[PDB]
């Protein structure tokens, strides 16, 4: 694509600059270009990819909810038209990310840390598609399938305090609660995840402890509202 002529290293450098400038669409385009070079991504690079698209789609999700709320209150074509415009752009971003994961990040991810990261991402962006879907069922089952594969690997290959495993469990629990309409599964998953992490904190350095307890706080935040 348009980043085909730029060095991989230069794309990564500019992704970092774009993050500093809060230019997240640029950041995402640079990391898309980096992925398309065909090499596997390092841990830092995966997180740049995720941060970039999370910020882009986050703005779209927030705009879509504003517009959807206005639309529902109003129930001329303008509100529906503009909600559809934003919705279509959001779906395009999700399709772009899913395309990168399928071509070919997931299949080339051999390690648990990379494969779980990408499968979690796959669940996340199917979940964002599900938020606006009205094929709804198949989108939901695609999210479920990706999250479940990531969960299975993470339980076999990672300690219960691993931040990737924790963020996965967090997001899968939210999927259960409000996408799958399975609130008891969501609560059970969040509780067990928090408890098993807590029992493993004693093995961690201070820095790893800070990483893990940050995500555990998010599990507890949700549980407080769910119970």
């Amino acid at each position: 694509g348009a980043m085909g002529s730029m060095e991989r290293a230069s794309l990564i450098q500019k992704a970092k600059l774009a993050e500093q400038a809060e230019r997240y669409e640029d950041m995402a385009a640079f990391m898309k270009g980096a992925v398309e070079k065909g090499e596997e991504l390092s841990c830092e690079e995966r997180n740049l990819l995720s941060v970039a698209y999370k910020n882009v789609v986050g703005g779209q999700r927030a705009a879509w909810r504003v517009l959807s709320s206005i639309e529902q209150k109003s129930n001329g074509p303008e509100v529906r038209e503009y909600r559809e415009k934003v919705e279509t752009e959001l779906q395009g971003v999700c399709d772009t990310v899913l395309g990168l994961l399928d071509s070919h990040l997931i299949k080339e991810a051999g390690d648990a840390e990379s494969r779980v990261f990408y499968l979690k991402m796959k669940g996340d962006y199917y979940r964002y598609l599900a938020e606006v879907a009205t094929d709804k069922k198949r989108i939901i089952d695609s999210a479920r399938s990706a999250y479940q594969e990531a969960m299975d690997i993470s339980k076999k290959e990672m300690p219960p305090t691993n931040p990737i495993r924790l963020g996965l469990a967090l997001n899968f629990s939210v999927f259960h609660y409000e996408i799958a309409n399975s609130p008891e599964e969501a609560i059970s998953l969040a509780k067990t995840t928090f408890d098993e992490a807590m029992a493993d904190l004693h093995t961690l350095s201070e820095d790893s402890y800070k990483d893990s307890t940050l995500i555990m706080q998010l599990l507890r935040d949700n549980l407080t509202l769910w119970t």
């Binding site: 999370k54 986050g58 703005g59 709320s69 967090l170 997001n171 939210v174 935040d221 949700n222 509202l225």
Partner: peptide, 12 residues
């Protein structure tokens, strides 16, 4: 909408 906590940038 009440958005629950998910991983990473609370960008929405």
């Amino acid at each position: 909408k009440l958005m629950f906590k998910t991983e990473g940038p609370d960008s929405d």
